[PDB]
Symmetry: C2
Subunit: 197 residues, 2 copies
Amino acid sequence: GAIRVYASSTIGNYILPEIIARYRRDFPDLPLEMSVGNSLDVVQAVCDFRVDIGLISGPCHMAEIVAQPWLEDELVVFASPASPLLEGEVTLERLAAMPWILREKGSGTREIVDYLLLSHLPQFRLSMELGNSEAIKHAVRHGLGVSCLSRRVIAEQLETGSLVEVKVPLPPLVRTLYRIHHRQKSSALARFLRYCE
Amino acid sequence: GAIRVYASSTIGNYILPEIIARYRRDFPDLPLEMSVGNSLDVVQAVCDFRVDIGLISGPCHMAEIVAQPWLEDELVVFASPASPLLEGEVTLERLAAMPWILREKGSGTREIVDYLLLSHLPQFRLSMELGNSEAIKHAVRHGLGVSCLSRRVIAEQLETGSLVEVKVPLPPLVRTLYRIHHRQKSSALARFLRYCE
């Protein structure tokens, strides 16, 4: 009778924990299962009835899927406080001149940086692709390059100053997170969904 | 010409970052790709030639795979500093009485806790299964339950005191991490492998 949720790493590590805490304290006997994956893997699990609720980056147009916009999410270019990018006026050429570190292909974060950020910059060879936010923050903190992540992921580091937000002369990188579930699917599901608001 | 490494989340977030930093500083022009996945997904990618180096939890007996023991890894039961488990002598019944939070099924961490820890405890219904270490640390910090992770993952929290190591009257939970690559595969690969020592 466990509730199964399939969400992205940004949602699973920086949005769901506060929701899970309030849901568990009010319902301590209902088991919870929370998997981390990108949009295509989550949609497949919902179609296969392997999970109950899916939280993805981007919309879903399948007739068997009930998809509703859930939360806005702003992505931010950031760098180490000792990065030369922080000195001088930021330009598109200066942004493309720094070594870049990006999330894994197929993730909603990498999709946003590819079409909304890197498309407006001069072409460059990607330095590193790290499939986890924690490894990216460590690499950026060590001056290995710059990156682009959700503000929720680096909010703690932006406050302490271990990471610095870089102002980019481009429209802000804002995405929409969606909540999905199968059309052929329920109580207790609705309870968890009420805590996600 | 990018080097592709496929490792577990514990290796990717708490072992590889220091290795990646030293490798990048000495070779800044060689692109790097680092994916995060469990042992079975990594072995498949090595067999499919999708990645070059695999770092997994546990051995591999396939003839096409060159598998060598790499690093020892000690797992630790931990709890919030305000957990009632920290008061009184720890027993197997007291450990089974706390709500438990564990990593996703198929991970090397969950495999260790299942056969080396939970097998010696009274049977219980698992409270939460979270497929990411960060969501587990937040859940444990909020008193939702106890967990078992690699000491490398919670080393920072064990030092500051935000998480407390629990002494268990059982043999220590020590595992062996392996490095794998295809037998039919190389220079520059050897360079990265020399930084992994």
